[PDB]
Symmetry: D2
Subunit: 179 residues, 4 copies
Amino acid sequence: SKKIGIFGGTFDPPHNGHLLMANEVLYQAGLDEIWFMPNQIPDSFHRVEMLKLAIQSNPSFKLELVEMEREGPSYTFDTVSLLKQRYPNDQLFFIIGADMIEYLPKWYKLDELLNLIQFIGVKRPGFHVETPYPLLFADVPEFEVSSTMIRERFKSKKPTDYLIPDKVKKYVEENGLYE
Amino acid sequence: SKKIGIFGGTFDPPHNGHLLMANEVLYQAGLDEIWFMPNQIPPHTDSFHRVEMLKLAIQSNPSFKLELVEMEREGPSYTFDTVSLLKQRYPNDQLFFIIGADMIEYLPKWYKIQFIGVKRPGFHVETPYPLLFADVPEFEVSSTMIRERFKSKKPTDYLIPDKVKKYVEENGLYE
Amino acid sequence: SKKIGIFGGTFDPPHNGHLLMANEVLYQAGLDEIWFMPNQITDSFHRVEMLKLAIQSNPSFKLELVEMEREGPSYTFDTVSLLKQRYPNDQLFFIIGADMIEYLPKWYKLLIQFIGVKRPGFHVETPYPLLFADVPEFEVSSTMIRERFKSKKPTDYLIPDKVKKYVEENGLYE
Amino acid sequence: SKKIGIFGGTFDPPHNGHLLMANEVLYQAGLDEIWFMPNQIPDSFHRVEMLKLAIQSNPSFKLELVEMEREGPSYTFDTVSLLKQRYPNDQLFFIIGADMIEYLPKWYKLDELLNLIQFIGVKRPGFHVETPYPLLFADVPEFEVSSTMIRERFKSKKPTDYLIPDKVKKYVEENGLYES
């Protein structure tokens, strides 16, 4: 019924590069929704709140907090397996860099995962990801912004305009984050 | 016990981007050798050809080696994947597999033997894995791009080793 | 005397790449204002309206139509000359791209100064004692955006929503 | 009679990125030769010897030392004017980054330089260049290598394999260069 694009990350904090990549994959892979799935380290409520603010304006974007759950999964196989059990009627896709598995030799563990859920490999306009694997590709325009660059900019008091949503910036300032 | 970097790929043909990445991983990760491992499709460029071009591409580098374990996974009743057969043959060595991290900012914990990520210098990557990276200078060259060049008669200089180009020519490969 | 960054362009349409580059030059080179200067040769009117919308939210950005007033019917000034003519005491900084090649030639015999823009980490050598602004890469252009509008592809996160809104209701870009 | 591509740089030292770019332009702009023109110091002996070594393998690559001459030109207009005078029957082209002039407003001093000689703008595959100016364009695969990175690698004792020609590395190490 629904084509869901699983989009993982730290989103510490979420930024324009995240929104851009998600929208491009959404359109290019003909998906219905993109689920922003924040990972967890064994703070979080701040990441959850900045994410909600970042995605608000895009009806096609959702927040998936399965990894935040008590005794929740963290390994992709487990996380994807649970989501498949919760949404058996939907078609799930997993987003990765198109080059993540380019240099790997034949590996059953990888194949098991690739057969569990349809992988979408993100790459820059043009460019070829050789190595044969079941993969849907999505060309996304390069936008060199990262959560780490953003954090240091806040710390060093450098501008963040056009790199992060205004609402995210406002939330960061009000909560004394990345000081 | 040696530190070995495993480099999978089709290598049709092998190019300077392959050589560069392998060498950077080799020194930045403090490894002893890099093993180039040509893959093969189930009959669905010929392998002996890709293997020959590889030998030529890595000749000049002593730390580079050709390994054909993916070409010998088939047993009379059981078939190993490349990773398991390698561990079988070299149980005492430290095998490092290479993971790309040049397109996305985050790397998922998709795997439950070590890994080395390769990204462009300056490119920030976050991941739950305590992973060591190798900052490889960007080199927008691929086998696909190279094949198109041979076919369309465009230059290949500085993109592929001269000996590999010579092989392609002496064997009429790539239209 | 202000420190003014001159930002030439076709801006049809203006996009987030333009705003980001301007903001970075503005701050990194410690300037007071950045002047977006549409070249003349989409009709000027629309490009001018889209530009106002694009820069509105940023106080340090200004629209300057001097390149559109270079004709005084007997003599035509080039933009640089009319600017010095109008603001002789201000410090005018022109922006030079240096993100494709390693070297920047001494092509100009140099009130007028230059600022180079390149990706962070990209090393540039030049005989010029030039200040560079490290602008994060953003692979977006006007041409690319026009094509997306024409083929009904997304433009979200690439251009300001107000610019997109203006394009749609004015039936611009087919 | 000859279509020449003027390729300026510090070439301190020359590396594979230079050779690649030059070959691509040559082919893409249908040129006959590419002239590597070392810029005047705002020593040179070593840069010149490495350049000779770097281009030896390509018959289409030539060395142009006009900026090295006593009382020689250093500004593009001056340099090009002298070269056009020395080679009146050939068609010269000047190589620059395609974005060099992308952000400049109408300027006659630039127009004058562009009419003096045909400019070629190098850029990455795809990605457009707005630029209300002549310019012939040449798409060149991105090869993230520069003379700065190389020098730092020699200093830090990092590998330079596949980044610079063997003969160049040989020259650097024989003359103990860049280990500052």
